[PDB]
Design an enzyme around this catalytic site. Structure first.
Site, PDB file in Angstrom:
ATOM      1  N   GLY A  54       0.720  -1.193   0.120  1.00 28.75           N
ATOM      2  CA  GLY A  54      -0.035   0.102   0.067  1.00 28.75           C
ATOM      3  C   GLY A  54       0.598   1.249  -0.118  1.00 28.75           C
ATOM      4  O   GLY A  54       2.126   1.308   0.315  1.00 28.75           O
TER       5      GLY A  54
ATOM      6  N   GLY B  92      -1.884   2.898   7.232  1.00 27.05           N
ATOM      7  CA  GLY B  92      -1.708   2.199   8.492  1.00 27.05           C
ATOM      8  C   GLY B  92      -1.292   0.654   8.442  1.00 27.05           C
ATOM      9  O   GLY B  92      -1.321  -0.110   9.178  1.00 27.05           O
TER      10      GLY B  92
ATOM     11  N   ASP C 196       7.307  -4.874   6.286  1.00 27.24           N
ATOM     12  CA  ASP C 196       6.781  -3.596   6.404  1.00 27.24           C
ATOM     13  C   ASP C 196       7.472  -2.517   5.406  1.00 27.24           C
ATOM     14  O   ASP C 196       8.316  -1.718   5.948  1.00 27.24           O
ATOM     15  CB  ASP C 196       6.705  -2.954   7.929  1.00 27.24           C
ATOM     16  CG  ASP C 196       5.849  -1.552   8.050  1.00 27.24           C
ATOM     17  OD1 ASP C 196       5.030  -1.270   7.148  1.00 27.24           O
ATOM     18  OD2 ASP C 196       6.093  -1.089   8.940  1.00 27.24           O
TER      19      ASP C 196
ATOM     20  N   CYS D 251      -7.147   2.811   1.024  1.00 30.86           N
ATOM     21  CA  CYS D 251      -7.990   3.863   1.493  1.00 30.86           C
ATOM     22  C   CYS D 251      -7.813   5.089   0.768  1.00 30.86           C
ATOM     23  O   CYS D 251      -6.590   5.638   0.840  1.00 30.86           O
ATOM     24  CB  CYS D 251      -7.811   3.897   3.012  1.00 30.86           C
ATOM     25  SG  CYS D 251      -8.878   5.101   3.603  1.00 30.86           S
TER      26      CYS D 251
ATOM     27  N   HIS E  50     -10.752  -7.827  41.473  1.00 32.99           N
ATOM     28  CA  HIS E  50     -12.028  -7.785  42.363  1.00 32.99           C
ATOM     29  C   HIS E  50     -11.369  -6.970  43.528  1.00 32.99           C
ATOM     30  O   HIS E  50     -10.341  -6.792  43.962  1.00 32.99           O
ATOM     31  CB  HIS E  50     -12.078  -9.356  42.739  1.00 32.99           C
ATOM     32  CG  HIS E  50     -10.723  -9.780  43.248  1.00 32.99           C
ATOM     33  ND1 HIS E  50     -10.367  -9.819  44.800  1.00 32.99           N
ATOM     34  CD2 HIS E  50      -9.720 -10.385  42.657  1.00 32.99           C
ATOM     35  CE1 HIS E  50      -9.206 -10.386  44.751  1.00 32.99           C
ATOM     36  NE2 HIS E  50      -8.874 -10.673  43.785  1.00 32.99           N
TER      37      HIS E  50
ATOM     38  N   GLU F  91      -9.483 -16.895  37.825  1.00 35.23           N
ATOM     39  CA  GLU F  91      -7.917 -16.705  38.338  1.00 35.23           C
ATOM     40  C   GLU F  91      -7.249 -18.273  37.831  1.00 35.23           C
ATOM     41  O   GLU F  91      -7.717 -19.281  37.681  1.00 35.23           O
ATOM     42  CB  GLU F  91      -7.875 -16.412  39.768  1.00 35.23           C
ATOM     43  CG  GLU F  91      -6.177 -16.329  40.203  1.00 35.23           C
ATOM     44  CD  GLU F  91      -5.408 -15.239  39.402  1.00 35.23           C
ATOM     45  OE1 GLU F  91      -5.299 -15.016  38.291  1.00 35.23           O
ATOM     46  OE2 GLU F  91      -4.816 -14.565  40.020  1.00 35.23           O
TER      47      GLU F  91
ATOM     48  N   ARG G 276       8.671 -23.161  40.240  1.00 35.77           N
ATOM     49  CA  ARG G 276       8.012 -22.011  39.803  1.00 35.77           C
ATOM     50  C   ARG G 276       8.810 -20.652  39.819  1.00 35.77           C
ATOM     51  O   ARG G 276       8.713 -19.873  38.959  1.00 35.77           O
ATOM     52  CB  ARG G 276       6.555 -21.994  40.707  1.00 35.77           C
ATOM     53  CG  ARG G 276       5.731 -20.792  40.167  1.00 35.77           C
ATOM     54  CD  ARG G 276       4.406 -20.983  40.814  1.00 35.77           C
ATOM     55  NE  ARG G 276       3.357 -20.511  40.207  1.00 35.77           N
ATOM     56  CZ  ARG G 276       2.812 -19.099  40.171  1.00 35.77           C
ATOM     57  NH1 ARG G 276       3.438 -18.404  41.309  1.00 35.77           N
ATOM     58  NH2 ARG G 276       1.961 -18.760  39.348  1.00 35.77           N
TER      59      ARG G 276
ATOM     60  N   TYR H  19       1.021 -19.702  33.320  1.00 36.89           N
ATOM     61  CA  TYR H  19       0.626 -18.462  32.421  1.00 36.89           C
ATOM     62  C   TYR H  19       0.665 -18.584  31.004  1.00 36.89           C
ATOM     63  O   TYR H  19      -0.336 -18.141  30.566  1.00 36.89           O
ATOM     64  CB  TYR H  19       1.836 -17.402  32.886  1.00 36.89           C
ATOM     65  CG  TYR H  19       1.694 -16.494  34.263  1.00 36.89           C
ATOM     66  CD1 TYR H  19       1.950 -16.943  35.439  1.00 36.89           C
ATOM     67  CD2 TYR H  19       0.975 -15.298  34.149  1.00 36.89           C
ATOM     68  CE1 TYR H  19       1.884 -16.300  36.563  1.00 36.89           C
ATOM     69  CE2 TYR H  19       0.771 -14.667  35.195  1.00 36.89           C
ATOM     70  CZ  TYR H  19       1.316 -15.189  36.552  1.00 36.89           C
ATOM     71  OH  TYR H  19       1.097 -14.518  37.651  1.00 36.89           O
TER      72      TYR H  19
HETATM   73  O1  LIG Z   1      -6.603   1.687   6.870  1.00 33.34           O
HETATM   74  C1  LIG Z   1      -5.904   2.584   7.655  1.00 33.34           C
HETATM   75  N1  LIG Z   1      -5.523   3.817   6.953  1.00 33.34           N
HETATM   76  C2  LIG Z   1      -4.943   4.908   7.568  1.00 33.34           C
HETATM   77  N2  LIG Z   1      -4.634   4.837   8.757  1.00 33.34           N
HETATM   78  C3  LIG Z   1      -5.054   3.651   9.387  1.00 33.34           C
HETATM   79  C4  LIG Z   1      -5.359   2.600   8.827  1.00 33.34           C
HETATM   80  C5  LIG Z   1      -5.669   1.676   9.832  1.00 33.34           C
HETATM   81  C6  LIG Z   1      -6.221   0.272   9.903  1.00 33.34           C
HETATM   82  C7  LIG Z   1      -6.206  -0.548   8.844  1.00 33.34           C
HETATM   83  C8  LIG Z   1      -6.813  -1.848   8.768  1.00 33.34           C
HETATM   84  C9  LIG Z   1      -7.325  -2.309   9.787  1.00 33.34           C
HETATM   85 BR1  LIG Z   1      -8.273  -4.054   9.994  1.00 33.34          BR
HETATM   86  C10 LIG Z   1      -7.531  -1.479  11.147  1.00 33.34           C
HETATM   87  C11 LIG Z   1      -6.952  -0.156  11.037  1.00 33.34           C
HETATM   88  C12 LIG Z   1      -5.144   2.048  11.122  1.00 33.34           C
HETATM   89  N3  LIG Z   1      -4.651   3.423  10.858  1.00 33.34           N
HETATM   90  C13 LIG Z   1      -3.878   4.407  11.782  1.00 33.34           C
HETATM   91  C14 LIG Z   1      -4.915   4.771  12.963  1.00 33.34           C
HETATM   92  C15 LIG Z   1      -4.253   5.593  13.641  1.00 33.34           C
HETATM   93  C16 LIG Z   1      -3.046   6.012  13.686  1.00 33.34           C
HETATM   94  C17 LIG Z   1      -2.104   5.336  12.583  1.00 33.34           C
HETATM   95  C18 LIG Z   1      -2.828   4.660  11.627  1.00 33.34           C
HETATM   96  O1  LIG Z   2       1.623 -16.116  39.677  1.00 37.03           O
HETATM   97  P1  LIG Z   2       1.642 -15.454  41.347  1.00 37.03           P
HETATM   98  O2  LIG Z   2       2.373 -14.347  41.605  1.00 37.03           O
HETATM   99  O3  LIG Z   2       1.435 -16.719  42.178  1.00 37.03           O
HETATM  100  O4  LIG Z   2      -0.099 -14.610  41.252  1.00 37.03           O
HETATM  101  C1  LIG Z   2      -1.290 -15.586  41.163  1.00 37.03           C
HETATM  102  C2  LIG Z   2      -1.657 -15.763  42.286  1.00 37.03           C
HETATM  103  O5  LIG Z   2      -1.990 -14.482  43.087  1.00 37.03           O
HETATM  104  C3  LIG Z   2      -3.299 -14.633  43.614  1.00 37.03           C
HETATM  105  O6  LIG Z   2      -4.188 -14.055  42.988  1.00 37.03           O
HETATM  106  C4  LIG Z   2      -3.467 -13.975  44.972  1.00 37.03           C
HETATM  107  O7  LIG Z   2      -2.221 -13.469  45.272  1.00 37.03           O
HETATM  108  C5  LIG Z   2      -3.853 -16.143  43.486  1.00 37.03           C
HETATM  109  O8  LIG Z   2      -5.179 -16.306  43.427  1.00 37.03           O
HETATM  110  C6  LIG Z   2      -2.801 -16.535  42.353  1.00 37.03           C
HETATM  111  O9  LIG Z   2      -2.690 -18.114  42.795  1.00 37.03           O
END
Ligand SMILES: O=c1[nH]cnc2c1c(-c1ccc(Br)cc1)cn2-c1ccccc1
Ligand SMILES: O=P(O)(O)OC[C@H]1O[C@](O)(CO)[C@@H](O)[C@@H]1O
Ligand SMILES: O=c1[nH]cnc2c1c(-c1ccc(Br)cc1)cn2-c1ccccc1
Ligand SMILES: O=P(O)(O)OC[C@H]1O[C@](O)(CO)[C@@H](O)[C@@H]1O
Lengths: 442, 442
Positions: free
Chosen positions: B38, B43, B121, B151, B250, B319, B344, B359
């Site tokens: 393009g 974008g 890019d 566009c 929470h 969690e 861990r 994780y």
């Molecule tokens: O199509 C564009 N034309 C010009 N600008 C654009 C886009 C898109 C874009 C394109 C495809 C999709 Br799926 C989602 C967003 C994001 N942006 C943009 C927005 C904010 C800042 C910098 C760039």
């Molecule tokens: O990965 P970390 O540091 O143990 O954090 C996740 C833990 O923390 C808590 O959200 C509470 O400290 C637990 O429910 C969970 O096991």
């Protein structure tokens, strides 16, 4: 303040509902009319049925309204393509009445029966018909999403006629050659008035998908919401290429012998015998390529190890989590947790084990498995009883109520062959004894 | 036979590897070159960066190769659009050398650094440049997937120049008006030789997506695999509409007070105070519409209950599952399971609790949450410490290694505002005391 109670079946925390002296219910987001577009033998009914099967399985109430079935009901016997002629004044009136009667049933389904998606399965080839469907949707506050299937390949058209059209109730008294010839003439009746979707100028404001050349290419215009985005993703992942899906459980494990649920036990001596029997079975199938999927639980991995084939472990394929009831026998569950045992027996699909899962949770977990199964060709899934019932309910179009009771015995391969508007299912018992883990409803 | 061992960190069952006297490693599917297509200010860099952020977060090693950055490195100071002139023989040679140097680094990334996706890019506006990239991909056994952004809206072009182009290192010594004028002339340099993708005739065999009018419409051609299908789905769900994402935990719960992990405990007196403070905060934000999401655990639901706003419970927001370590304090974990505790501490991202999660598992679970967050506008997510770290790592482009250590204190709202090529993060402590659950690495 902030007083909540945990619902006994689903284990959902809800506000303590101290209903006043006179309890009031606020009985009962916008429903969608999916409009199929295209000439006959373009796989519109195939798309309608498959999409409905997927949407219902993920928990979105969906129903197909096929205008041809309303026609077969209004008109006793089908004679020929002459019924579909544009100069057939009487049949044109009948066909319009049938479409309007189907729309009447669409309104009743979405506004009065708790349906979320209505798939309007007809040609809807003219702008006039589509404008009328749009008017119907706007006046009833229904969303409209168009799915057009465009294909001009004569091989694809002929294949569709041979696979599912010649076998139609319309061609009962006809032989394959007569039915094929009549159907080609029937398609020609629609070609003159056919106005394809034009997202460039005319249909610019419509929410639509154009499926071009059996899903080789797609034109996607104005996807409004979550469900339309999901449909589009699904259509882009499915294919009509020939393939086989083999589904089985891990070979019998030590917990199976003790009648214990869950856990991560290893294969019993019989389970190891099944694993060897499965390798021989797989070899005898003589498949060019085969993808093997297992859970992350030992018993399915040990079974795959016997195949001497590459395999992929999916945590999503792990057996239903029984929470506090893990590693217990059903007798120990009934004696330690009698309330929990009875609740599950009464509502097996929605019942959630404490700190565990429901069959409903399994479906959500298995959604990516299903999407990947659709993309793939020859696949062998080595899993667990509840996981297998969920996957099977998807392929066999079984309801949420039926799903927890589907028969999935140990040491038995379920061979799924996609044919017509679903799956042909063959069962292959690999002649290795095991315990029975199936429990019927009470 | 079929002897397996469970890996200590990830808890994966692997074949017992009794390596022979001389252990042999078979060191180390096909990588993909994503080709951006393009005119400038379309974008392409926005798409490149966002897609890379998502792919890395889901576990697909991805890197952007921006040809303009290779140019800023080769050419000391940027003077004007005259550098981009088609008659500028010298700069045309330099620009080609920069593109070839970026491709050299693409080859090194995909074939020698364990990279799976390279996002190229550049404008890649001519068929000649794209044929050269295709030759490079075919000779290196890399897949090629084209993403074109089309566009012609002057409001969108002007907005892009104002938001992220005028602030470019190229326009450091320029004022907003000079930079905007130079950039418009710079775009004009590319317009004559620009050959858009033609999936109808010329580019029929290419795997591509045409993003038309900032994602209003899409042309999708020949999606070959899983990753391309995922990219397409992602592009169809993201938007550039202004909105705010509020993330919080929470309110303090009873387990927090006892230093216990997991469980399904209710809000403490301070937690209930936070819930009221959150309602006041939400009210003060004066948002037209706001979606509220919680987990299925009591503490997040009780917090949402205080808002008097409709909310949706997601099991995916629950969690991290600590398996056998659920409801235990960290001291009780170290004393009962010292091996598990140390494992861990050494590998917090990949470590899986016995019968529990990592994780890494959280990311897989949270994928649908992220996809829905992208689709939505103003959203408030009331969740848990580990879930919040995962979501935050996605929005803030944090690595898997950093993710388990991100600071997500109780009674604190993280206000995310999408701006330029990412998120602006504001922290809002709601002045209610709580315990600290953050634990730094050792
Ligand atoms: O199509 C564009 N034309 C010009 N600008 C654009 C886009 C898109 C874009 C394109 C495809 C999709 Br799926 C989602 C967003 C994001 N942006 C943009 C927005 C904010 C800042 C910098 C760039
Ligand atoms: O990965 P970390 O540091 O143990 O954090 C996740 C833990 O923390 C808590 O959200 C509470 O400290 C637990 O429910 C969970 O096991
Ligand atoms: O585009 C078609 N044209 C003719 N026939 C077709 C199709 C499709 C189809 C269409 C879109 C997608 Br995404 C996937 C399959 C399926 N069928 C079909 C195949 C077997 C039996 C009956 C019908
Ligand atoms: O829903 P049901 O009939 O209890 O079946 C699922 C159960 O069956 C088993 O697969 C073994 O019988 C358990 O692992 C699991 O809890």
């Amino acid at each position: 303040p902030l007083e909540l109670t945990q619902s006994r079946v689903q284990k959902i925390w809800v506000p303590v509902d101290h209903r006043p002296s006179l309890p009031r219910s606020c009985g009962p987001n916008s429903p969608t009319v999916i409009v199929m577009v295209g000439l006959p033998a373009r796989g519109k009914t195939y798309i309608s049925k498959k999409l409905t099967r997927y949407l219902n399985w993920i928990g979105v109430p969906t129903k197909v309204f096929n205008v041809g079935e309303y026609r077969r009901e209004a008109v006793k016997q089908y004679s020929s393509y002459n019924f579909f002629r544009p100069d057939n004044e009487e049949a044109m009136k009948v066909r319009k009445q049938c479409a309007l009667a189907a729309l009447r049933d669409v309104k009743s389904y979405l506004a009065k029966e708790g349906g979320q998606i209505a798939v309007f399965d007809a040609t809807n080839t003219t702008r006039e018909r589509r404008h009328m469907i749009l008017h119907f949707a706007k006046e009833n506050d229904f969303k409209a999403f168009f799915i057009e299937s465009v294909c001009d390949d004569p091989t694809v058209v002929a294949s569709n006629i041979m696979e599912v059209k010649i076998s139609s109730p319309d061609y009962k008294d006809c032989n394959s050659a007569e039915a094929m010839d009549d159907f080609m003439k029937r398609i020609s009746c629609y070609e003159a008035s056919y106005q394809p979707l034009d997202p460039d100028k005319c249909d610019r404001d419509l929410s639509l998908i154009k499926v071009i050349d059996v899903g080789r290419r797609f034109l996607v215009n104005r996807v409004q919401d979550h469900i339309q985005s999901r449909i589009v993703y699904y259509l882009m992942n499915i294919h009509v290429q020939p393939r086989t899906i083999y589904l089985c459980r891990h070979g019998e494990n030590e917990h199976n012998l003790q009648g214990r649920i869950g856990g991560d036990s290893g294969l019993s001596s019989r389970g190891k015998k099944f694993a060897s029997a499965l390798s021989k079975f797989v070899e005898e199938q003589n498949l060019k390529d085969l993808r093997v999927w297992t859970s992350q639980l030992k018993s399915t991995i040990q079974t795959a190890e016997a195949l001497r084939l590459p395999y992929e472990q999916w945590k999503a394929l792990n057996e239903i989590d029984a929470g506090v009831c893990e590693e217990l026998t059903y007798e120990e569950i009934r004696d330690t947790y009698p309330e929990e045992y009875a609740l599950r027996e009464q509502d097996k699909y929605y019942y959630r084990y404490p700190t565990g899962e429901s069959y409903q949770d399994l479906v959500q977990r298995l959604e990516p498995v299903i999407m990947e199964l659709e993309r793939q060709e020859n696949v062998l899934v080595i899993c667990h009883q509840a996981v297998l019932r969920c996957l099977l309910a998807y392929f066999l179009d079984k309801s949420a109520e039926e799903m927890p009771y589907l028969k999935c015995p140990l040491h038995t391969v379920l061979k799924l062959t996609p044919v017509a508007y679903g799956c042909r299912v063959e069962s292959i018992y690999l002649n290795v004894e095991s315990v029975c883990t199936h429990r019927e409803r009470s």
